[PDB]
Amino acid sequence: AQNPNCNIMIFHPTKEEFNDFDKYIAYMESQGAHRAGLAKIIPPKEWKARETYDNISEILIATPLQQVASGRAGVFTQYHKKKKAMTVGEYRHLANSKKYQTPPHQNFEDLERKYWKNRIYNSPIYGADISGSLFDENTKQWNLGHLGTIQDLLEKECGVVIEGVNTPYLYFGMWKTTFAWHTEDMDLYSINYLHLGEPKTWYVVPPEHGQRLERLARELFPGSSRGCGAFLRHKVALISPTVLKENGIPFNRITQEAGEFMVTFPYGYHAGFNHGFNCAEAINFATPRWIDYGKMASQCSCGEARVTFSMDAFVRILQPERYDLWKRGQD
Ligand SMILES: O=C(O)CNC(=O)C(=O)O
Ligand SMILES: [Mg+2]
Ligand code: NI
Ligand SMILES: [Zn+2]
Numbered sequence: 466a467q468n469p470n471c472n473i474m475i476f477h478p479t480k481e482e483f484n485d486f487d488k489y490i491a492y493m494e495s496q497g498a499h500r501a502g503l504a505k506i507i508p509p510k511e512w513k514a515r516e517t518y519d520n521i522s523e524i525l526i527a528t529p530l531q532q533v534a535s536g537r538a539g540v541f542t543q544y545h546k547k548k549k550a551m552t553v554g555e556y557r558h559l560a561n562s563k564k565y566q567t568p569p570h571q572n573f574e575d576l577e578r579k580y581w582k583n584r585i586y587n588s589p590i591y592g593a594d595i596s597g598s599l600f601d602e603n604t605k606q607w608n609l610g611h612l613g614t615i616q617d618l619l620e621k622e623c624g625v626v627i628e629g630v631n632t633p634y635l636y637f638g639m640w641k642t643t644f645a646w647h648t649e650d651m652d653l654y655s656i657n658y659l660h661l662g663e664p665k666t667w668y669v670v671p672p673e674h675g676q677r678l679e680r681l682a683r684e685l686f687p688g689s690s691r692g693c694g695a696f697l698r699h700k701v702a703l704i705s706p707t708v709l710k711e712n713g714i715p716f717n718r719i720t721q722e723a724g725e726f727m728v729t730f731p732y733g734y735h736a737g738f739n740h741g742f743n744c745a746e747a748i749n750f751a752t753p754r755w756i757d758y759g760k761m762a763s764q765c766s767c768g769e770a771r772v773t774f775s776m777d778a779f780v781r782i783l784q785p786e787r788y789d790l791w792k793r794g795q796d
Contacts, residue, residue, distance in 0.1 A: 468497025471671035473504065473717045480509040483606045487613070490654075490728070490752060499754075501717060502733025503669040506726040508607065515601040518661045521744070522554030524635070526592035529556065532643055534585040539705035540685050541585050543643060548590060553637060553744075556592060560639035560742035565589060567640040567663065567741035573720050577666060580738050581705045584641050592637030599635065599660050599746055607726065609633045609658060609748045616775070618751040625782055629775030633748040638665070638739030645700045646682065646736040648675070650772055651779045652762040653749040655729040657721075663741030665721045668706060672732040674715045681712050698765035703736060731758035759783045766794035 468474065474496065478489055489506075498504040530545040551559070559565060565587075570576040598610040605611075614631040640663075649655050659665060670678045679697065683690040686702050693699070709716050721727050723743070729735055731754070751759075760783045765772075772795075781788050 466497070467495070468500045471500040471502070471673070471715065471717070473501045473669065473719045474498045475505040475507065477507050478509060480511045480606075483509055483512060486607060487752065493728070494754065498728075499730040499733075500671055500673065501669060502671050502730050503667060503717070503719065503735060504728045504730075505719060505721065506728065508724070508726065512604075512606060514604055514658065514660060515599060518599075518744075521599065522552060522557070524553040524595070524597070526551055526553065526556055526595060526637060530591045530593060531588045532591055532641075533588045534703075536585065538582060538585055539708040541703050542686070542689070542701045543645065543703065544701065545591075546588075553592075556590070556637055556639075557742055559590065565639050573664070573666065573740075576740060580641065580666075581707070584643065584738070587641055589639050589641040589643075591639070591642040592635070595635040595637070596632055597635050598633050599744070607658075609656060609746050612656075612748060612750055615653065615749060615751045616778070618753075619756075619779070619782065622753055622756050623782065627778035627782060629778050631749065631775065633746050636745045636747065638662075638741075638743045638745070640739065640741050642739045643703065644735075644737050646678070646702050646704060646734055647697055647700045648732055648734055648762075649729065649749055650776055651783070652731045652758040653751055653755060654731060655747055655749050657727045657729070657745055657747040659721050659723050659725055660744045660746060661723055662743030663739065664723075665737055665739050665743065665745065666718065667721060667727065667735055667737040668709075668716055668718050669729070670714065670716050670734040672730060675732050675734050677714050678734050681709075681714055693765055693767040693769060695763040695765045695770070696767075697734070698763065698770040700770075731755050732762075756783070764791050766790045768794050771795060
């Protein structure tokens, strides 16, 4: 069995190996990459996402979110307070202001310590889930707006044509902006490209151990758990590496830098934080190996998680018994 310790693997494809996305994902899995839940892909030196980032300041962040924490330093929830619209240029200036800028630090480990010690005492502002792309249309390899769609994949594997579309999203981050512990909708893959700026630190639990994380989360968030059997789908719960280690949960950590891709694999729970002003682009995708995970994915039926249009068909076709209850939670 390849990668039996479930370590995060890092790949360096050549330009020839960068031509066929599906083939290279399947190659990574042949080496056991999926067992970690997360892999890093460093693109060939010949590749670029676009020519420059000099012309992005006029992108609008229609609904910036202030991430307000409740709890203790290693175990907290966050809610998202809506703020007034601002441009990427205005947000960048805000990120770099004294109130929000990254503090002086020695290295990534020192910044991680500072994050976990101090995150709860501040409320950083995040631009999330902005439909759009920063890939040049003439970038032909690993262009996140030109991947095969999940609806086409389900049709190819299972024979059923379904409605829906699959497009990328942009994320504008600052110091302390946080992504809570979650798997993807319908336990899909994700791919994330850090276009510019400061790093992103990731934490991940191997898919084969995901239920260990869920059990700890029910213990640490007992009211949330009573409310919803799939409350991690709400994307609000944080648990520090120190707390995970105290509870014997298997996990790994890695820092993504500008110009690097990350792939999350089906049922790989992940969380993390941004180091300073940055911009990432991400999209969900599927492969033949996803289908069996999609059929078994938990679902939030309490009202809180309330998802993409295009999730309807995946629940309807892969999870017909759950469909009626799930849909009641969407109305
Ligand atoms: O860029 C982000 O905010 C974090 N993205 C994800 O959780 C992802 O790509 O799966
Ligand atoms: Mg612009
Ligand atoms: Ni994710
Ligand atoms: Zn719920």
